[PDB]
Short mmCIF file of C-alpha atoms and ligand atoms in Angstrom, two decimals:
data_model
loop_
_atom_site.label_atom_id
_atom_site.label_comp_id
_atom_site.label_asym_id
_atom_site.label_seq_id
_atom_site.Cartn_x
_atom_site.Cartn_y
_atom_site.Cartn_z
CA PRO A 188 -1.48 -16.81 -24.79
CA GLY A 189 -2.42 -17.58 -21.15
CA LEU A 190 -5.80 -17.70 -19.35
CA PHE A 191 -6.37 -15.99 -15.99
CA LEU A 192 -9.06 -17.43 -13.71
CA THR A 193 -9.87 -16.66 -10.12
CA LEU A 194 -11.82 -18.18 -7.27
CA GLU A 195 -13.48 -16.07 -4.59
CA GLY A 196 -15.67 -16.48 -1.49
CA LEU A 197 -15.63 -16.61 2.30
CA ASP A 198 -12.98 -18.58 4.14
CA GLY A 199 -14.15 -22.20 4.14
CA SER A 200 -16.32 -21.86 1.03
CA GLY A 201 -14.31 -24.55 -0.87
CA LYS A 202 -11.92 -22.25 -2.91
CA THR A 203 -8.72 -24.21 -2.38
CA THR A 204 -10.52 -27.47 -3.01
CA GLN A 205 -12.00 -26.21 -6.29
CA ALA A 206 -8.75 -24.53 -7.24
CA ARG A 207 -7.02 -27.89 -6.78
CA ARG A 208 -9.72 -29.75 -8.68
CA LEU A 209 -9.62 -27.21 -11.56
CA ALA A 210 -5.83 -27.52 -11.88
CA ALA A 211 -6.21 -31.32 -12.00
CA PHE A 212 -8.89 -31.17 -14.71
CA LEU A 213 -6.60 -28.94 -16.77
CA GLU A 214 -3.53 -31.20 -16.22
CA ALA A 215 -5.65 -34.17 -17.47
CA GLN A 216 -6.34 -32.13 -20.62
CA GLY A 217 -2.59 -31.57 -21.12
CA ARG A 218 -2.89 -27.84 -20.34
CA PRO A 219 -0.03 -26.18 -18.40
CA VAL A 220 -1.43 -24.62 -15.26
CA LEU A 221 -0.18 -22.54 -12.34
CA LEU A 222 -1.94 -22.48 -8.99
CA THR A 223 -1.38 -19.43 -6.76
CA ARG A 224 -3.08 -17.44 -3.99
CA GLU A 225 -3.51 -14.22 -2.09
CA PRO A 226 -2.43 -13.11 0.36
CA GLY A 227 1.24 -14.24 0.22
CA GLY A 228 1.65 -15.00 -3.50
CA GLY A 229 3.63 -11.72 -3.87
CA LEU A 230 5.01 -10.95 -0.41
CA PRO A 231 4.84 -13.97 1.92
CA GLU A 232 5.76 -11.62 4.81
CA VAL A 233 2.53 -9.61 4.36
CA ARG A 234 0.54 -12.80 4.97
CA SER A 235 2.40 -13.68 8.15
CA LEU A 236 2.27 -10.09 9.42
CA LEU A 237 -1.52 -9.77 8.91
CA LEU A 238 -2.03 -13.17 10.56
CA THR A 239 -0.91 -11.72 13.91
CA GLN A 240 -1.86 -8.00 13.76
CA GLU A 241 -5.00 -6.06 12.97
CA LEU A 242 -4.51 -2.59 11.45
CA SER A 243 -6.71 0.21 10.15
CA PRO A 244 -8.65 -1.13 7.08
CA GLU A 245 -6.79 1.43 4.97
CA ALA A 246 -3.38 0.12 6.11
CA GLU A 247 -4.57 -3.50 5.61
CA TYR A 248 -5.80 -2.79 2.11
CA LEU A 249 -2.51 -1.17 1.22
CA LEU A 250 -0.56 -4.21 2.43
CA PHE A 251 -2.87 -6.51 0.51
CA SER A 252 -2.23 -4.27 -2.54
CA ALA A 253 1.55 -4.31 -2.15
CA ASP A 254 1.39 -8.11 -2.03
CA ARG A 255 -0.93 -8.04 -5.03
CA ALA A 256 1.46 -5.75 -6.97
CA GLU A 257 4.35 -8.27 -6.49
CA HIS A 258 2.03 -11.18 -7.21
CA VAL A 259 0.87 -9.85 -10.55
CA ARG A 260 4.39 -8.85 -11.72
CA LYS A 261 6.50 -11.79 -10.44
CA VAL A 262 4.06 -14.70 -10.62
CA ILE A 263 0.88 -14.09 -12.60
CA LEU A 264 1.99 -12.15 -15.68
CA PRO A 265 5.10 -14.38 -16.21
CA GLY A 266 2.78 -17.42 -15.93
CA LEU A 267 0.38 -15.99 -18.50
CA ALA A 268 3.23 -15.01 -20.85
CA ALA A 269 4.45 -18.60 -20.88
CA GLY A 270 0.93 -19.69 -22.02
CA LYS A 271 -0.21 -21.11 -18.67
CA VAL A 272 -3.70 -21.19 -17.25
CA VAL A 273 -3.08 -19.24 -14.07
CA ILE A 274 -5.55 -19.80 -11.23
CA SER A 275 -5.50 -17.48 -8.23
CA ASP A 276 -7.30 -18.49 -5.05
CA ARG A 277 -8.38 -14.90 -4.24
CA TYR A 278 -7.59 -11.73 -6.16
CA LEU A 279 -8.77 -8.04 -6.18
CA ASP A 280 -12.39 -8.99 -5.51
CA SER A 281 -11.28 -10.21 -2.07
CA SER A 282 -10.16 -6.67 -1.16
CA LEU A 283 -13.41 -5.25 -2.59
CA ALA A 284 -15.55 -7.67 -0.53
CA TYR A 285 -13.57 -7.58 2.78
CA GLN A 286 -12.05 -4.04 2.95
CA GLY A 287 -14.82 -2.37 0.90
CA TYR A 288 -18.16 -3.98 1.65
CA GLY A 289 -16.91 -5.49 4.96
CA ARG A 290 -14.90 -2.63 6.46
CA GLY A 291 -16.56 0.27 4.64
CA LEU A 292 -13.66 1.56 2.48
CA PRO A 293 -14.84 3.44 -0.62
CA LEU A 294 -14.79 1.21 -3.66
CA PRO A 295 -13.77 3.80 -6.25
CA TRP A 296 -10.68 4.56 -4.16
CA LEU A 297 -9.93 0.82 -3.80
CA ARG A 298 -10.14 0.44 -7.60
CA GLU A 299 -7.92 3.48 -8.30
CA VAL A 300 -5.28 2.06 -5.96
CA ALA A 301 -5.67 -1.31 -7.70
CA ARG A 302 -5.35 0.11 -11.19
CA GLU A 303 -1.47 0.39 -11.02
CA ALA A 304 -1.06 -2.46 -8.57
CA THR A 305 -2.72 -4.89 -10.99
CA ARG A 306 -1.51 -3.19 -14.22
CA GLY A 307 -5.27 -3.47 -14.93
CA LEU A 308 -5.09 -7.28 -15.17
CA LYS A 309 -8.59 -8.80 -14.80
CA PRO A 310 -9.48 -12.48 -14.74
CA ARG A 311 -11.45 -13.82 -17.71
CA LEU A 312 -13.71 -15.66 -15.27
CA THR A 313 -14.18 -15.58 -11.52
CA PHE A 314 -15.82 -18.48 -9.69
CA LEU A 315 -17.65 -17.20 -6.61
CA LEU A 316 -18.31 -19.98 -4.07
CA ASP A 317 -21.37 -18.53 -2.36
CA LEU A 318 -22.72 -19.66 1.06
CA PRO A 319 -23.89 -18.12 4.37
CA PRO A 320 -21.14 -17.54 6.99
CA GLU A 321 -22.60 -20.22 9.31
CA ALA A 322 -22.28 -22.80 6.50
CA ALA A 323 -18.49 -22.20 6.11
CA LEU A 324 -15.80 -24.67 7.26
CA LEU A 325 -15.42 -9.14 12.80
CA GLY A 326 -18.48 -10.97 14.32
CA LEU A 327 -21.15 -12.64 12.11
CA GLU A 328 -22.41 -9.19 10.89
CA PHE A 329 -19.03 -8.57 9.19
CA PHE A 330 -19.11 -11.89 7.30
CA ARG A 331 -22.68 -11.23 6.16
CA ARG A 332 -21.51 -7.86 4.76
CA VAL A 333 -18.65 -9.64 2.95
CA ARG A 334 -20.88 -12.40 1.57
CA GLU A 335 -23.50 -9.92 0.30
CA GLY A 336 -20.63 -7.69 -1.09
CA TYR A 337 -19.43 -10.61 -3.19
CA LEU A 338 -22.96 -11.17 -4.55
CA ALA A 339 -23.15 -7.39 -5.28
CA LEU A 340 -19.93 -7.56 -7.25
CA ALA A 341 -21.11 -10.64 -9.13
CA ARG A 342 -24.42 -8.99 -10.06
CA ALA A 343 -22.54 -5.96 -11.53
CA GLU A 344 -20.23 -8.12 -13.68
CA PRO A 345 -22.31 -11.13 -14.79
CA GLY A 346 -19.94 -11.71 -17.76
CA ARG A 347 -17.00 -12.36 -15.47
CA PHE A 348 -18.60 -13.94 -12.35
CA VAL A 349 -19.95 -17.45 -12.11
CA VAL A 350 -21.84 -17.89 -8.83
CA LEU A 351 -21.95 -21.41 -7.41
CA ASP A 352 -23.85 -22.84 -4.49
CA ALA A 353 -20.85 -23.74 -2.34
CA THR A 354 -23.01 -26.01 -0.11
CA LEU A 355 -23.35 -28.51 -2.99
CA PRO A 356 -21.18 -31.59 -3.00
CA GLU A 357 -17.58 -31.11 -4.08
CA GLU A 358 -17.70 -33.13 -7.36
CA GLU A 359 -20.86 -31.41 -8.54
CA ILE A 360 -19.38 -27.90 -8.08
CA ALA A 361 -16.24 -29.04 -9.92
CA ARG A 362 -18.25 -30.26 -12.93
CA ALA A 363 -20.18 -26.94 -12.99
CA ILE A 364 -16.88 -24.95 -13.12
CA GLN A 365 -15.68 -27.29 -15.86
CA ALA A 366 -18.79 -26.70 -17.97
CA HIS A 367 -18.30 -22.89 -17.78
CA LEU A 368 -14.65 -23.22 -18.64
CA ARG A 369 -14.97 -25.47 -21.71
CA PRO A 370 -15.87 -22.79 -24.30
CA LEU A 371 -12.51 -21.11 -23.51
CA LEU A 372 -10.44 -24.25 -24.40
CA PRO A 373 -8.41 -25.58 -26.11
CA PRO B 199 -5.35 22.30 17.62
CA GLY B 200 -1.64 21.30 17.70
CA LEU B 201 0.97 21.93 15.00
CA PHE B 202 2.18 19.43 12.36
CA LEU B 203 5.79 19.86 11.16
CA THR B 204 7.92 17.74 8.89
CA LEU B 205 11.50 17.33 7.83
CA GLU B 206 12.53 16.14 4.42
CA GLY B 207 15.57 15.61 2.21
CA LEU B 208 17.96 13.01 0.90
CA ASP B 209 19.58 10.19 2.81
CA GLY B 210 22.40 11.88 4.72
CA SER B 211 20.94 15.47 4.59
CA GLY B 212 20.72 16.02 8.42
CA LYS B 213 16.96 15.74 8.83
CA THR B 214 17.12 13.32 11.79
CA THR B 215 19.66 15.61 13.43
CA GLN B 216 17.46 18.71 12.97
CA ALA B 217 14.19 16.88 13.87
CA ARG B 218 15.68 15.82 17.18
CA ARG B 219 17.18 19.22 17.89
CA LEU B 220 13.86 20.89 17.16
CA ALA B 221 11.94 18.48 19.41
CA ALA B 222 14.30 19.20 22.31
CA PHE B 223 14.23 22.95 21.55
CA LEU B 224 10.43 23.09 21.64
CA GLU B 225 10.29 20.87 24.74
CA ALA B 226 12.75 23.27 26.46
CA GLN B 227 10.17 26.02 25.78
CA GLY B 228 7.62 23.96 27.78
CA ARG B 229 5.83 22.81 24.60
CA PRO B 230 4.38 19.32 24.35
CA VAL B 231 6.08 17.55 21.44
CA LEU B 232 5.61 14.18 19.71
CA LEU B 233 8.67 13.15 17.67
CA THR B 234 8.02 10.49 15.08
CA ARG B 235 9.27 9.21 11.70
CA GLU B 236 8.59 7.29 8.50
CA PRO B 237 8.93 4.56 7.58
CA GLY B 238 8.02 2.70 10.78
CA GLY B 239 5.93 5.19 12.77
CA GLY B 240 2.69 3.39 11.81
CA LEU B 241 3.81 -0.17 11.19
CA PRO B 242 7.33 -0.84 12.51
CA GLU B 243 7.54 -4.15 10.57
CA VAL B 244 7.30 -2.25 7.24
CA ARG B 245 11.09 -1.70 7.31
CA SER B 246 11.45 -5.47 6.92
CA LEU B 247 8.99 -5.49 4.05
CA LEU B 248 10.70 -2.57 2.36
CA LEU B 249 14.01 -4.48 2.21
CA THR B 250 12.49 -7.15 -0.04
CA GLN B 251 14.73 -7.80 -3.01
CA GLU B 252 13.62 -6.55 -6.43
CA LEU B 253 10.44 -4.90 -5.10
CA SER B 254 8.37 -3.25 -7.82
CA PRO B 255 8.26 0.52 -7.29
CA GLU B 256 4.41 0.16 -7.03
CA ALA B 257 4.63 -2.35 -4.13
CA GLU B 258 7.34 -0.22 -2.63
CA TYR B 259 5.02 2.80 -2.57
CA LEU B 260 2.09 0.74 -1.35
CA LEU B 261 4.19 -0.44 1.65
CA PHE B 262 5.19 3.16 2.49
CA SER B 263 1.50 4.06 2.23
CA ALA B 264 0.33 1.25 4.53
CA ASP B 265 2.74 2.54 7.17
CA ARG B 266 1.60 6.12 6.53
CA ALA B 267 -2.10 5.23 6.88
CA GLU B 268 -1.49 3.56 10.24
CA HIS B 269 0.89 6.38 11.32
CA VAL B 270 -1.63 9.16 10.64
CA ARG B 271 -4.57 7.31 12.32
CA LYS B 272 -2.72 5.95 15.33
CA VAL B 273 0.09 8.46 16.10
CA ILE B 274 -0.15 11.82 14.30
CA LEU B 275 -3.91 12.69 14.45
CA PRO B 276 -4.20 11.79 18.17
CA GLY B 277 -1.05 13.85 18.97
CA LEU B 278 -2.35 16.89 17.16
CA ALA B 279 -5.79 16.42 18.82
CA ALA B 280 -4.08 16.71 22.23
CA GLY B 281 -2.46 20.04 21.30
CA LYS B 282 1.03 18.60 20.64
CA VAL B 283 3.54 19.89 18.14
CA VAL B 284 4.00 16.69 16.09
CA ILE B 285 7.29 16.50 14.22
CA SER B 286 7.67 13.81 11.61
CA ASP B 287 11.12 12.89 10.26
CA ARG B 288 9.78 12.18 6.72
CA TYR B 289 6.17 12.17 5.50
CA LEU B 290 4.29 11.98 2.18
CA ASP B 291 6.74 14.27 0.32
CA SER B 292 9.38 11.51 0.72
CA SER B 293 7.15 9.26 -1.35
CA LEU B 294 6.52 11.98 -3.95
CA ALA B 295 10.24 12.58 -4.30
CA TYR B 296 11.47 8.95 -4.03
CA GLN B 297 8.67 6.92 -5.60
CA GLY B 298 7.47 9.69 -7.89
CA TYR B 299 10.51 11.54 -9.21
CA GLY B 300 13.03 8.82 -8.30
CA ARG B 301 11.22 5.62 -9.39
CA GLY B 302 9.04 7.30 -12.01
CA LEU B 303 5.55 6.46 -10.58
CA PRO B 304 2.80 8.84 -11.77
CA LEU B 305 2.30 11.70 -9.23
CA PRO B 306 -1.50 11.76 -9.53
CA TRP B 307 -1.79 8.07 -8.64
CA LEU B 308 0.53 8.66 -5.66
CA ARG B 309 -1.67 11.52 -4.53
CA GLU B 310 -4.90 9.55 -5.02
CA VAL B 311 -3.56 6.70 -2.90
CA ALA B 312 -2.40 9.31 -0.33
CA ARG B 313 -5.72 11.03 -0.06
CA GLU B 314 -7.27 8.21 2.07
CA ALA B 315 -3.96 7.10 3.57
CA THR B 316 -3.35 10.57 5.07
CA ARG B 317 -7.03 11.67 5.27
CA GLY B 318 -5.82 14.89 3.64
CA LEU B 319 -3.45 15.78 6.51
CA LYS B 320 -0.68 18.20 5.43
CA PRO B 321 2.11 19.65 7.57
CA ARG B 322 1.91 23.40 8.27
CA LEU B 323 5.60 23.67 7.40
CA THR B 324 8.10 21.30 5.88
CA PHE B 325 11.82 21.85 6.32
CA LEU B 326 13.62 20.52 3.25
CA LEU B 327 17.32 20.06 3.82
CA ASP B 328 18.54 20.42 0.30
CA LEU B 329 21.70 18.26 -0.14
CA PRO B 330 23.80 17.70 -3.28
CA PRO B 331 23.03 14.21 -4.63
CA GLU B 332 26.64 12.91 -4.58
CA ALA B 333 26.63 13.56 -0.79
CA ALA B 334 23.71 11.08 -0.34
CA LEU B 335 26.12 8.26 -1.30
CA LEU B 336 15.98 0.09 -0.87
CA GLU B 337 17.64 -0.84 -4.18
CA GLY B 338 18.94 1.16 -7.17
CA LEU B 339 19.80 4.15 -4.95
CA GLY B 340 22.81 5.34 -7.01
CA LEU B 341 23.69 8.76 -8.35
CA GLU B 342 21.22 9.07 -11.21
CA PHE B 343 18.38 8.14 -8.79
CA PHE B 344 19.48 10.68 -6.16
CA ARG B 345 19.78 13.43 -8.75
CA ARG B 346 16.11 12.82 -9.70
CA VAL B 347 14.96 12.76 -6.07
CA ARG B 348 16.89 15.90 -5.16
CA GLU B 349 15.47 17.85 -8.06
CA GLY B 350 12.08 16.28 -7.28
CA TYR B 351 12.10 17.70 -3.79
CA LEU B 352 13.02 21.13 -5.20
CA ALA B 353 10.04 20.98 -7.61
CA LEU B 354 7.72 20.04 -4.78
CA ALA B 355 9.07 23.00 -2.84
CA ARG B 356 8.40 25.40 -5.75
CA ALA B 357 4.86 24.03 -6.18
CA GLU B 358 4.02 24.72 -2.52
CA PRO B 359 6.21 27.67 -1.52
CA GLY B 360 4.30 28.61 1.65
CA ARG B 361 4.63 25.10 3.15
CA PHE B 362 8.23 24.28 2.23
CA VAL B 363 11.21 26.03 3.77
CA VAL B 364 14.30 25.04 1.72
CA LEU B 365 17.58 25.11 3.62
CA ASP B 366 21.20 24.47 2.56
CA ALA B 367 21.99 21.09 4.12
CA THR B 368 25.78 21.79 3.96
CA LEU B 369 25.52 24.68 6.47
CA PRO B 370 26.65 23.95 10.04
CA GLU B 371 24.01 22.16 12.20
CA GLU B 372 23.51 25.16 14.55
CA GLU B 373 22.94 27.55 11.68
CA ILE B 374 20.24 25.31 10.18
CA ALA B 375 18.60 24.84 13.59
CA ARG B 376 18.55 28.62 14.11
CA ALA B 377 16.90 29.10 10.69
CA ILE B 378 14.26 26.45 11.47
CA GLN B 379 13.54 28.12 14.83
CA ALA B 380 13.13 31.53 13.17
CA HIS B 381 10.52 30.18 10.72
CA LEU B 382 8.61 28.70 13.68
CA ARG B 383 8.64 31.72 15.98
CA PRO B 384 5.43 33.28 14.50
CA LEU B 385 3.49 29.97 14.93
CA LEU B 386 4.81 29.35 18.48
CA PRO B 387 3.04 30.96 20.21
N1 ACP C 94 24.94 20.33 8.91
C1 ACP C 94 25.74 19.24 8.86
N2 ACP C 94 27.03 19.24 8.38
C2 ACP C 94 27.81 18.13 8.35
N3 ACP C 94 27.38 16.93 8.80
C3 ACP C 94 26.11 16.80 9.31
C4 ACP C 94 25.20 17.96 9.37
N4 ACP C 94 24.04 17.58 9.94
C5 ACP C 94 24.15 16.26 10.20
N5 ACP C 94 25.39 15.81 9.84
C6 ACP C 94 25.92 14.44 9.93
O1 ACP C 94 25.58 13.79 8.68
C7 ACP C 94 25.27 12.41 8.94
C8 ACP C 94 23.84 12.10 8.50
O2 ACP C 94 22.97 12.94 9.25
P1 ACP C 94 21.47 12.42 9.60
O3 ACP C 94 21.48 10.93 9.94
O4 ACP C 94 20.80 13.38 10.59
O5 ACP C 94 20.80 12.65 8.14
P2 ACP C 94 19.43 11.98 7.66
O6 ACP C 94 18.50 11.83 8.78
O7 ACP C 94 18.83 12.91 6.55
C9 ACP C 94 20.05 10.32 7.21
P3 ACP C 94 18.91 9.09 6.54
O8 ACP C 94 17.76 9.57 5.47
O9 ACP C 94 19.74 7.97 5.95
O10 ACP C 94 18.13 8.51 7.83
C10 ACP C 94 25.48 12.18 10.44
O11 ACP C 94 26.78 11.65 10.62
C11 ACP C 94 25.38 13.57 11.06
O12 ACP C 94 26.11 13.74 12.27
C1 TMP C 95 -6.56 -11.38 -0.55
C2 TMP C 95 -7.34 -10.80 0.61
C3 TMP C 95 -7.66 -11.59 1.72
N1 TMP C 95 -8.35 -11.06 2.77
C4 TMP C 95 -8.64 -11.87 3.95
C5 TMP C 95 -9.59 -13.02 3.73
C6 TMP C 95 -9.03 -14.12 4.58
O1 TMP C 95 -9.77 -14.05 5.80
C7 TMP C 95 -7.57 -13.74 4.82
C8 TMP C 95 -6.60 -14.62 4.08
O2 TMP C 95 -6.55 -15.80 4.82
P1 TMP C 95 -5.43 -16.93 4.62
O3 TMP C 95 -4.02 -16.37 4.50
O4 TMP C 95 -5.66 -17.62 5.97
O5 TMP C 95 -5.99 -17.53 3.35
O6 TMP C 95 -7.39 -12.44 4.30
C9 TMP C 95 -8.76 -9.72 2.74
O7 TMP C 95 -9.39 -9.29 3.72
N2 TMP C 95 -8.48 -8.94 1.66
C10 TMP C 95 -7.79 -9.39 0.59
O8 TMP C 95 -7.50 -8.65 -0.38
C1 TMP C 96 9.20 7.73 4.14
C2 TMP C 96 9.86 7.30 2.87
C3 TMP C 96 11.22 6.94 2.87
N1 TMP C 96 11.82 6.54 1.72
C4 TMP C 96 13.21 6.09 1.71
C5 TMP C 96 14.28 7.03 2.25
C6 TMP C 96 15.33 6.02 2.66
O1 TMP C 96 16.12 5.65 1.54
C7 TMP C 96 14.47 4.88 3.20
C8 TMP C 96 14.19 4.99 4.68
O2 TMP C 96 15.19 4.20 5.28
P1 TMP C 96 15.43 4.22 6.86
O3 TMP C 96 14.19 3.54 7.44
O4 TMP C 96 16.69 3.38 6.96
O5 TMP C 96 15.57 5.69 7.17
O6 TMP C 96 13.20 4.98 2.59
C9 TMP C 96 11.09 6.47 0.53
O7 TMP C 96 11.66 6.04 -0.51
N2 TMP C 96 9.78 6.82 0.52
C10 TMP C 96 9.11 7.22 1.59
O8 TMP C 96 7.91 7.52 1.48
CL1 CL C 97 -11.96 -21.69 1.04
CL1 CL C 98 -10.60 -7.79 -11.31
CL1 CL C 99 -24.69 -23.95 -8.34
CL1 CL C 100 -0.72 21.86 11.75
CL1 CL C 101 2.15 26.34 -0.18
MG1 MG C 102 -14.06 -15.29 5.65
MG1 MG C 103 -13.01 -27.18 -9.52
MG1 MG C 104 -2.98 -9.85 -1.11
MG1 MG C 105 -5.25 -3.87 -4.83
MG1 MG C 106 -11.29 -12.41 -8.28
MG1 MG C 107 -18.34 -6.04 -9.94
MG1 MG C 108 17.53 9.76 9.41
MG1 MG C 109 6.10 5.32 5.37
MG1 MG C 110 1.13 7.54 0.72
MG1 MG C 111 6.78 16.15 4.48
MG1 MG C 112 4.42 20.20 -3.84
#
């Protein structure tokens, strides 16, 4: 069977924390789970390369997509096929928010590139950890464009996105994610 | 302004040889020339990425395209804007032949990705050094693959017969260079 879930938001919005808490909840229920992330879940070398260089947004998107293409084929789809709940800390929506809304790349192009890269794989639910940039643990204008881009995406796909106030305490956010997830188990 | 030229063909077809000859030939005529290549002209580290074992053909193309996007923006468009003859040893047609005909990726997707990557930039002429596939001898680059790529290049040449100049790669180096030069004479000046 398999269940594909993602977490999205600005750096320091609590994604890795909530990813780790969601995996733990699922383990306590006896459900096999796989935790993964972008960038680097497909091509670790893309992550390291982008850490130290800044490229055109078009080149950056394409590297993020090459990583994503390997990630879907070698990690995510095999995980789903084995019946795992696969949780990715960032997925396509990260490219849409950062390279699209942030850097100005056209979204329909981004999605056409993604179409083969992802084999059209979409998560069943996406938890958006929403907060202002100055509440996170370029320039500020960029991060505002990203944050608002995420909320734009969420608004267009209310079936898939769950928007959470990421400034709330950690345990409270975790329980909110759990409540949304329950109807899709066991 | 400026003139955009490319060379294409299989591994081992002589395109580096002819690209370098042409660059020197044009520079001897007092013409400003920028000699470049793919992969690596945009993002030199992509050659490392491309070597990754068991790469999906989709990721493989996406890596070529990342390099190409950076290459066009940072090297080719500024060279052409300064009035240079820019010569690229491989460009987008390499992807169409290798990733499209070779690996089997759908051509329209390849082109849609390319459209932003290249910003629509096409060479004025492309010199295809047509080499028999057995003479060519990434992963899976055996005979069946090279046959597909070789024929792929020939189909691309037929689809765009004004852009592509197809040359017999087995001819002596000086004969091919002379043929390339003759095709260029009407554009230069
Ligand atoms: N017309 C010709 N006849 C015979 N040999 C030739 C030739 N032109 C080039 N060569 C030789 O063939 C070999 C490969 O040539 P070259 O490296 O220029 O091809 P290419 O650039 O298409 C290789 P690749 O795609 O692997 O980078 C070299 O040893 C070169 O000296
Ligand atoms: C996955 C992904 C991440 N990013 C950015 C967001 C983060 O700032 C950075 C990843 O950071 P990390 O490797 O330090 O987690 O990459 C994009 O811009 N586009 C994408 O598609
Ligand atoms: C530019 C380009 C090269 N190639 C291939 C040709 C060679 O086999 C290899 C380039 O290797 P090289 O960097 O050692 O010349 O990449 C493609 O498959 N697609 C492309 O778009
Ligand atoms: Cl985070
Ligand atoms: Cl998606
Ligand atoms: Cl909330
Ligand atoms: Cl031109
Ligand atoms: Cl033509
Ligand atoms: Mg951020
Ligand atoms: Mg959680
Ligand atoms: Mg990525
Ligand atoms: Mg993508
Ligand atoms: Mg997502
Ligand atoms: Mg949306
Ligand atoms: Mg060469
Ligand atoms: Mg390239
Ligand atoms: Mg391309
Ligand atoms: Mg070309
Ligand atoms: Mg053609």
